[PDB]
């Protein structure tokens, strides 16, 4: 459990103080742990942070696994997933500590590698919507991996680079894109 | 020069270290300048940054015009614009700096007031490529302004969230996208 308490106190610390700002001395004392132990488990603050990101991503995966019960067809699952990504980012705290981490440990192929292994988990989501949609012939795509990376990064920049518009607008652009994209696949 | 040897050091500094990573002291120091210089020409530091942005947005917008003849129809102009975006040296590079800086000053108003200013220069290249396309007959888009905004960001996502993998796979990815997209329009 001492492992988990470290993960827990860290997530919080990162939300309240940001990334570069949180210190491992803090992490160790607030988790009533030890420097030694922390090294044993994570080796670095960067990996500590990465581990968190896996666990969040694990929750998200799970979160969505239930929210999708209200999407009967895959066309639907595509529109809904794109939206949830847009809406649920507004009020998702970690988001700042991530932006702060990514725009730093970005130039390190070292971290950037573990970073991608993770970026794929968020990409498979689509991978599946497209596969299924295929079997249920909702469309007939055939390089689901390419189309999937395209969708994940398109959606992603709509989410990221539109922060200046008021939410009722962003959610409007996003649904349109889902249509134009989905449209261009048939 | 002096003032043109400052922007010269900021540009690069922002691109390397980050929006934060590079501090006022940094700039001026490696800029061989006085901390006052900044004051009369470059108001604030976020100002020196919001400056290098239009600089970049123009240099690129310009380079685009000089090469956009290679593309005969507007449908070709679409692929090409997106294609070149991946390879330019202008603007796109400090796209990270942007993200960081937007979330680090979004709780102010000189943000939307000037972001949207740079954001209208940005999505403009598509405005014309789509507008003309209507005139040209290559397609019919009623919401051009909308579509421009959407396209510009999906594309900025692809250019940005893929900077690490083989430069040629990007051009491939980007082109299957430009296709899926133009397809959804007609
Ligand atoms: C409401 O809760 C949310 C909402 C949204 C979340 C979004 C993401 N994660 C947790 C979330 C979460 O965790 C609880 C972790 C992994 C991830 C990788 C990404 C991405 C978004 C996310 O964009 C592209 O790469």
From Swiss-Prot, chains A, B:
A molecular function (GO) term: DNA binding
Feature: DNA-binding region: 23-42
InterPro entries documented for this protein: DNA-bd_HTH_TetR-type_CS, Homeodomain-like_sf, HTH-type_Tx_Regulator, HTH_TetR, Tet_transcr_reg_TetR-rel_C_sf, Tscrpt_reg_QacR_C
GO term, biological process aspect, one: negative regulation of DNA-templated transcription
Signal peptide: none
Pfam families: TetR_C_5 (PF08360), TetR_N (PF00440)
Coiled-coil annotated spans: none
Swiss-Prot/TrEMBL keywords: DNA-binding, Plasmid, Repressor, Transcription, Transcription regulation
Domain HTH tetR-type: residue ranges: 1-60
Highest taxon above the source species: Bacteria
Assembly and oligomerization: Homodimer. Binds cooperatively to DNA as a pair of dimers.
Function, as annotated: Transcriptional repressor of qacA. Binds to IR1, an unusually long 28 bp operator, which is located downstream from the qacA promoter and overlaps its transcription start site. QacR is induced from its IR1 site by binding to one of many structurally dissimilar cationic lipophilic compounds, which are also substrates of QacA.
Name of this chain's protein: HTH-type transcriptional regulator QacR
Natural source organism: Staphylococcus aureus
Gene designation per UniProt: qacR
């Amino acid at each position: 459990n001492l492992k988990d308490k470290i993960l827990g106190v860290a997530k919080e610390l990162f939300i309240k103080n940001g990334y570069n700002a949180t210190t491992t001395g803090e992490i160790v004392k607030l988790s009533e742990s030890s420097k030694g132990n922390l090294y044993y488990h994570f080796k670095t603050k960067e990996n500590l942070f990465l581990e968190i990101l896996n666990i969040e991503e694990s929750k998200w995966q799970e979160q969505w696994k239930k929210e999708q019960i209200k999407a009967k067809t895959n066309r639907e699952k595509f529109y809904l997933y794109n939206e949830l990504s847009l809406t649920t980012e507004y009020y998702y705290p970690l988001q700042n500590a991530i932006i702060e981490f990514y725009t730093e440990y970005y130039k390190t192929n070292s971290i950037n590698e573990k970073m991608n292994k993770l970026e794929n988990k968020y990409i498979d989501a689509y991978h599946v919507i497209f596969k299924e949609g295929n079997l249920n012939g909702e469309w007939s795509i055939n390089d689901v991996n390419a189309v999937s990376k395209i969708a994940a990064n398109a959606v992603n920049g709509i989410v990221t680079f539109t922060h200046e518009q008021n939410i009722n607008e962003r959610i409007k652009l996003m649904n349109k894109f889902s249509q134009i994209f989905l449209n261009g696949l048939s």
